[PDB]
Design a protein around this nucleic acid. Structure first.
Lengths: 143, 100, 111, 48, 116, 50
RNA sequence: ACCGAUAGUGAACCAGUACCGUGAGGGAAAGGUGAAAAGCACCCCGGAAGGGGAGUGAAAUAGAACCUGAAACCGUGUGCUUACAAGUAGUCAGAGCCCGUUAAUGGGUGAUGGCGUGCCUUUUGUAGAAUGAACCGGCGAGUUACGAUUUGAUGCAAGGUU
RNA sequence: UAACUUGGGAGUCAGAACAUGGGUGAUAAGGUCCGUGUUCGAAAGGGAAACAGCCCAGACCACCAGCUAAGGUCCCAAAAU
RNA sequence: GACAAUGGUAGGAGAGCGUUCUAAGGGCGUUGAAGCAUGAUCGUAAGGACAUGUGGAGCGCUUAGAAGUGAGAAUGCCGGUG
């Protein structure tokens, strides 16, 4: 009628990088889920992915509030009788730091065919450097 | 250069030489019409205020007065013998903005 | 130019014949007679006699040389089945279907 | 004229037929309600 | 006299079969199965006509909110200012302004910010 | 055990995907000129002569 | 103001006959080439059957399994689409590709996003794991005669009617 | 803005939960039997994650218009980090 | 043209469409009727036309009349086919 929709032709995605040094886990994951989804611009167009690529460096030094380093347990099953595993939050940050951050963000995205292509735009690294220097990612301040 | 006019309970952004479809009008096919209530004028011209700007009326010529495609309104309740089918063709009027 | 040959009221069941017609479809007239002659299905001598007469019509009635004839279309349709009865235990009786098919071969010259 | 005949307005009507579709209002149950003695074929009790 | 039912049942059964074309499998071939899906489509269309007005109005609100965060303001502080300023421009027109003309949306924001 | 449901045309045609036969694997004999099976005699005029 | 081959007699047909029971007895299915046989001489593949031409005819996709020839169902080609995906199989929104209409706010396909647990019976209550339906076609259930009562209409009226 | 009277045709006599006043049971039961309201039954729509009976509200049809109710405004997911 | 009304089961009341046959009137057809097939057509619904293929001899329209007058289901009956 008189409403504009964005198709595959007129879409421009940018690269951003976020620093996770001294930020809360849940407070940081929510704003990154908005950048990946594409709700930051005026050409939303729900049935088409218009989000931007984002990179999170320093996956370690992610702070918790309260007794969360010990009293937060991650459960998972393996489709085998009795087979159930449990890992505390403090141990996950020590062995697989990126997995702690990557799963908190993927839990906020919708679980659809399009909601799976958006979660593939995230790159989390425990160190202070990223290999994707070919592109030009600009730094971004969380609000 | 565009303008925002209120015509049939809604608002439409018009442009010079454009085919728009609105609610039924009392004017005859081939005659002219004039929209008096304009809410916003912008684009290339200078920006103006609201709710209604002074003058700045829009004139347009009538093209055709017809009906849209037919729809079928069918509803029913399960396990309760009560169904009803209706039909509908909504009339409309086509205009062409010749001057803004 | 085409040449057809149809075999009707063939006692062999149709879906047993379609397994062999899916092999000669698209081949040449020489490569198809060999494929049908070196296989050991039940409908092998039947399809060959239908493909052989389709080439005899292409040379007698129509005028074309069989050096470059290809098989253009091959398919099998249904026919009038035969209803039979097989006696079973405790007095029950089952039904037996003696099916029938229609064979069709179409050769062409590609021009 | 036998090709232009009109009965008196208000003297003729069409009979009612039950059990013909659902839009007539006299469909499945045909104006008898649900199960009971007054719903089976053969009437009911004598008024005597 | 006897009235054989003929050519009158085939005619109304063929209209329902045609109304259901493009469906999957027996939903477009058999009559008893296509008749039910035709009735389900009529009930679905009546519900989705009144829901099309819902999910479009919310689509404009997001596009307006995204255009307001650029100017250090939220959607809640923008529509409150447009009321105290007496603008009366609906969501459908505010969504098509910021997309096409970026200069026009700044004039509406400054007037709405001055109204506080 | 009896089938709980009917069978579709889609499910019936997917199962018969591999219900096919292959080419007999024939070659040409340079004594009779006609096609023949491998490691066998020319069924027409000729012999093996391996 | 009766039926027109599931109708009308069980029987339009060589029917109380095939057939089924020791027996008394019970009982179907099966109409239509064309105005006229003028029922395809001869040739070709084949052991035959059946086909491809040529002829007969106004018509042979009217060739005796012979008027018209519907649906289920079984096939042969192609324009879009599909091998990381959780599906009462539709609906609303929507790119890309491909066609061109009873000419109008066009047709076919559907990457992706919303919302959505069939139908009928019977129940306080059913997506129900309560009942019925494999699919398609045909057939298949408030009727007539005579009385009573109450309504509309028409004729005459202290009379009305056989 | 309805009531009463005369005549024609009916259906219904298996009800359920929730709030509340009470018997029975054990100040047990989605128990059972009575009084008084509401909804379902015969009611779609929004909310309570899904959920005839609970809260809001009674669908003549069409629209890519606006304002509110119960409930809500970090992300899923419309609106205050 | 002003105001008000239009969710609905058992059930009550009103208004309409279609099938077959009869009467009167008036029409169509071997320059191709009924039927069958396809289409992007017209009505508030039940439903009504037109064009193009197939078909080879009957059939609508207007006003009344009379009904073996409308099918999705009864472990329904018969036939065909999965």
């Amino acid at each position: 009628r008189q409403t504009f929709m964005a198709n595959e032709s007129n879409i421009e995605r940018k690269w951003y990088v976020i620093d996770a040094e001294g930020q809360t886990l849940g407070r940081l994951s929510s704003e990154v889920a908005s950048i990946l989804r594409g709700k930051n611009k005026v050409t939303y167009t729900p049935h088409v992915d218009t989000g931007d690529y984002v990179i999170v460096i320093n996956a370690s030094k992610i702070e918790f509030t309260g007794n969360k380093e010990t009293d937060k347990v991650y459960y998972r099953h393996s489709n085998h009788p009795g087979g159930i595993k449990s890992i505390t939050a403090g141990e996950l940050r020590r062995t697989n730091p990126e997995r702690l951050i990557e799963n908190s963000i993927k839990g906020m995205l919708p679980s659809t065919r399009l909601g799976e292509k958006q979660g593939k735009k995230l790159f989390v690294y425990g160190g202070a450097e990223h290999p994707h220097a070919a592109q030009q990612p600009e730094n971004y301040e969380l609000r | 250069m565009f303008a925002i006019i209120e015509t049939g309970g809604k608002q439409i952004k018009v442009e010079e030489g454009q085919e728009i479809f609105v609610e039924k009008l009392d004017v005859n096919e081939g005659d002219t019409f004039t929209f008096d209530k304009v809410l916003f004028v912008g684009g290339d011209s200078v920006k103006v205020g609201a709710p209604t700007v002074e003058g700045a009326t829009v004139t347009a010529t009538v093209n055709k007065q017809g009906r849209g495609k037919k729809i079928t309104v069918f509803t029913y309740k399960r396990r309760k013998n009560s169904k009803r089918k209706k039909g509908h063709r909504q009339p409309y009027t086509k205009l062409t903005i010749d001057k803004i | 130019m085409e040449a057809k040959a149809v075999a009707r009221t063939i006692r062999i069941a149709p879906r047993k014949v379609r397994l062999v017609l899916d092999l000669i479809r698209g081949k040449n007239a020489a490569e198809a007679i060999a494929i049908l002659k070196l296989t050991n299905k039940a409908s092998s001598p039947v399809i060959e006699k239908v493909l052989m007469s389709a080439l005899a019509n292409a040379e007698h009635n129509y005028d074309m040389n069989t050096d470059e004839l290809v098989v253009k279309e091959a398919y099998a349709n249904e026919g009038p089945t035969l209803k039979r009865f097989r006696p079973r235990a405790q007095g029950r009786a089952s039904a037996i279907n003696k099916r029938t098919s229609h064979i069709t071969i179409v050769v062409s010259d590609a021009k | 004229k036998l090709h232009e005949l009109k009965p008196a307005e208000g003297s003729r009507k069409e009979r009612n037929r039950v059990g013909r579709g659902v839009a007539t209002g006299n469909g499945k149950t045909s104006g008898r309600g649900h199960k009971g003695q007054k719903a089976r074929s053969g009437g009911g009790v004598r008024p005597g | 006299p006897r009235v054989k039912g003929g050519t009158v049942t085939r005619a109304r059964r063929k209209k329902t079969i045609k109304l259901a074309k493009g469906y999957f499998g027996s939903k477009h071939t058999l009559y008893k199965v296509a008749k039910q899906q035709v009735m389900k489509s009529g009930q679905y269309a009546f519900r989705d006509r009144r829901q099309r007005k819902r999910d479009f109005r919310k689509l404009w609100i997001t596009r307006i909110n995204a255009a307001a965060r650029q100017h250090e303001m939220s959607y809640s502080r923008l529509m409150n200012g447009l009321k105290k300023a007496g603008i009366d421009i609906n969501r459908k027109m505010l969504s098509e302004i910021a997309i096409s003309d970026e200069k026009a949306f700044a004039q509406l924001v400054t007037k709405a910010k001055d109204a506080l | 055990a009896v089938p709980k449901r009917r069978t579709s045309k889609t499910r019936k045609n997917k199962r018969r995907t591999h219900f096919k036969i292959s080419v007999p694997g024939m070659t040409e004999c340079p004594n009779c000129g006609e096609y023949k099976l491998s490691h066998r005699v020319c069924k027409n005029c000729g012999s093996y002569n391996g």
